[PDB]
Design a protein around this ligand. Structure first.
Ligand SMILES: CSc1ccccc1CC(=O)N1CC[C@](O)(c2c[nH]nn2)C1
Ligand SMILES: [Zn+2]
Length: 140
């Protein structure tokens, strides 16, 4: 579980998106595992606009924030699960770290702000859906 609240938007994992997210959809991308929906109140999370490769992420399976080195967003092959088949997910960044399915939504952050949220995992690796290129989230 977990979301980003920036302006009048809510960013969640497309596979965890609620009924109310679809009844107010703004943008969604199955290959990115991202879904943006509309909120009534203003959000206060700042999105990082940078090329940072070091940061801190929340892991709910450990009630802990872990510092990590992560690769740049890339087209990475992801194992088949009950939400998606085995395919290449785009804008994905991998780090060596603990990750469990219920961890999806935990924010990855650098000194510039919010980099993304947990999307993939297993094998002692944790994958994050980058949001630093969705420049429109700030404006409108
Ligand atoms: C943190 S995910 C994880 C952690 C430990 C083990 C396995 C996983 C993978 C998983 O169960 N899923 C469920 C949907 C998934 O998040 C996904 C796929 N593509 N985009 N989102 C991958
Ligand atoms: Zn940064």
């Amino acid at each position: 579980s977990g979301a980003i609240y920036v302006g009048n938007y809510r960013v969640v994992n497309r596979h965890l998106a609620t009924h109310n997210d679809w009844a107010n959809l703004v943008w969604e991308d199955s290959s990115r595992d991202l879904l943006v929906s509309s909120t009534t109140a203003q959000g206060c999370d700042t999105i990082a606009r940078c090329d940072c490769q070091t940061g801190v992420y929340y892991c709910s399976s450990r009630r802990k924030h872990y510092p990590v080195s992560f690769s740049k967003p890339s087209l990475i092959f992801v194992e088949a699960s009950e939400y998606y088949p085995a395919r290449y997910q785009s804008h994905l960044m991998l780090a060596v770290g603990h990750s469990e399915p219920g961890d999806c939504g935990g924010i990855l952050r650098c000194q510039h702000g919010v980099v993304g949220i947990v999307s993939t995992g297993g094998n002692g690796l944790v994958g994050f859906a980058d949001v630093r290129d969705l420049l429109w989230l700030d404006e409108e």
